[PDB]
A = this chain, B = another copy of it.
């Protein structure tokens, strides 16, 4: 039919088969109730002493116990398939957003993404299972009801089934006519209400002219008109209910009139009529739900379509073949112009950055708008629009994503934290690679030895949600320890730590210097000390690299950096 994620469900059929076969019993039981109704009324409650009012009290409760157990098992075992389908769908979907470009997560639809994964995943299988159980049970109650209703007094069955749609369509046409009549009559009431508003509007003119009495008379007339219009409207609306009631009663009266003639006689009995009528009445609800099933199956398998769109959206480019054993290379730029998608302003103009290996460079972004993007390019998160980033004699486009991202490390005050323990967080994705002693040494080199050692559970304290919830400074220290453990030749320093912790942010800074004492570092300078620590100052204005050079060179000629050293004060 419409969507066919069928393979994902294919494994979980046994559960679905059991649920369905136990669910059809959930209508077999309801039908057997009304089946037992006939012996009850005709034979039991009559002057017949007993044995239909002693066996029946037990059987009704036993069969309801069966109904309850089948309902529970059907619901649970369809919820098993729903759970094991929604869980696999969610798992696949998420596993196809961990290799999906940052562009989508650049607030293209990021806010809804959790909603997209959870609400829609819950809705797809929820609505599909609802459609199944409403097109099996309520689609089986109908079948069993018909079997019984033709088993009991088929002639009455026919005279009732032919009447039901005729009466239904007659009711529909009468209701349509009267609804149209009332809606049409509403127009006159609207007109007179507009006249009332008009009369209320002219307060000033009425008062200045002393027409209070004349306006009272005119309101008398329009209000009599309004009351008469309401009278006729209410009369027309009220004469609807008696008409439909009379039509239904006429249907019943004809049904019984047919009972007089010998055509259906001996199909009357006493119970038989009750069971047939009760079955026909109770047939509406199953059919009422069945006629609407297509809406549900569709809403749900369509959300599945919406989910499919995400599952098959753009994927991160991976057109690389070469790997890295060590990125002991020189970072090189040449006319590197880039623009982050979903925007019009160009990000970067031509670039000629020759950041050599073994030495660091501090880029200063006093403009403060879009500067960080320059770092995102070297880490291949937003694809470069124009130019190339020449790394170790090769471009990143040519180079495999995994190795490239591995060689570069990010550090920021807003660093995210995982939900596992701190020891794993430090060696995230490579816990087996390094021994706990290595992690402790990294923490030492991160100058958070006392802090990390003082957590309640020590080295393996749960560090994320449902944990101790460190502050920003401690998070920075553990991120620095992460970088130390990974020993990325390329460092990216956010330097967003506007907060100055006493005796600790200086410890943090010592950790930063030790980390960047070696290795090539690109520091998005925002603090004073880092600018002081600058090795090759790189200024940028809006989207262009205005100047480059060491501290003294740009300090001598005011240009940009020198004035920045003053407005930064």
Measuring CB to CB, which residues of chain A are less than 8 angstroms from any residue of chain B?
Answer: 41-42, 45-47, 50, 53-54, 56-58, 60-61, 64-65, 67-69, 71-72, 75-76, 79-80, 82-84, 86-87, 90-91, 94-95, 97-100, 102, 105, 110-111, 113-114, 117-118, 122, 193-216, 218-220, 223-224, 226-228, 230-231, 234-235, 238-239, 241-243, 245-246, 249-250, 252-254, 256-257, 259-261, 265, 268-274, 379, 381, 402, 405-406, 408-410, 415-416, 418-420, 428-429, 431, 464-466, 482, 486
Contacts and interface: CB of A to CB of B under 8 A. Distances in A.
Given A197-B111, A210-B405, A61 B420 contact: no
Contacts of A216: 94-95, 98
A315 to B, nearest CB: 13
A491 B451 CA distance: 88
A348 B46 CA distance: 95
Nearest to A78: B234
A53 B226 contact: no
A378 to B, nearest CB: 10
A234 B79 contact: yes
Given A90-B223, A95-B216, A269-B46, A245 B53 contact: no
Q: Find the residue from A42, A196, A238, A241 having the highest chain B CB count within 10 A.
A: A238
B260 A196 contact: no
Contacts of A218: 418-420
A267 to B, nearest CB: 10
A60 B249 contact: yes
Nearest to A70: B242
| Copies of this polypeptide in the complex | 2
B419 A195 contact: yes
Nearest to A238: B75
Contact of A242 (B69, B243, B466): B69
Contacts of A265: 50
Contacts of A230: 79, 83, 86, 122
A195 to B, nearest CB: 6
24 contacts: A41-B274, A45-B272, A53-B268, A56-B256, A57-B254, A61-B246, A72-B235, A76-B231, A76-B234, A87-B227, A98-B206, A102-B203, A102-B207, A110-B200, A114-B193, A195-B419, A202-B416, A204-B381, A204-B416, A205-B410, A207-B405, A210-B402, A214-B431, A218-B420
A46 B42 contact: yes
A218 B210 CA distance: 83
A466 B225 CA distance: 15
B91 A54 contact: no
A558 B466 CA distance: 79
A210 B419 contact: no
Given A86-B230, A98-B207, A202-B418, 18 more contacts: A41-B273, A41-B274, A56-B256, A61-B250, A71-B238, A72-B238, A72-B242, A76-B234, A90-B226, A98-B216, A102-B204, A114-B193, A122-B230, A195-B466, A202-B416, A209-B428, A213-B429, A218-B419
Contact of A428 (B214, B224, B408): B214
Contacts of A231: 76, 79-80, 83
Which 6 A-B pairs rank lowest in CB-CB distance, beginning with the nearest? A68-B242, A211-B429, A53-B260, A64-B249, A75-B238, A202-B416
A182 to B, nearest CB: 14
Q: Find the residue from A65, A204, A250, A428 having the highest chain B CB count within 10 A.
A: A204
Contact of A410 (B208, B214, B253): B208
A121 to B, nearest CB: 10
B84 A227 contact: yes
B269 A45 contact: yes
Given A110-B201, A213-B429, A253 B61 contact: yes
Contacts of A87: 223-224, 226-227
B46 A91 contact: no
A209 B270 contact: no
A386 to B, nearest CB: 23
Contacts of A379: 207-208
A323 to B, nearest CB: 12
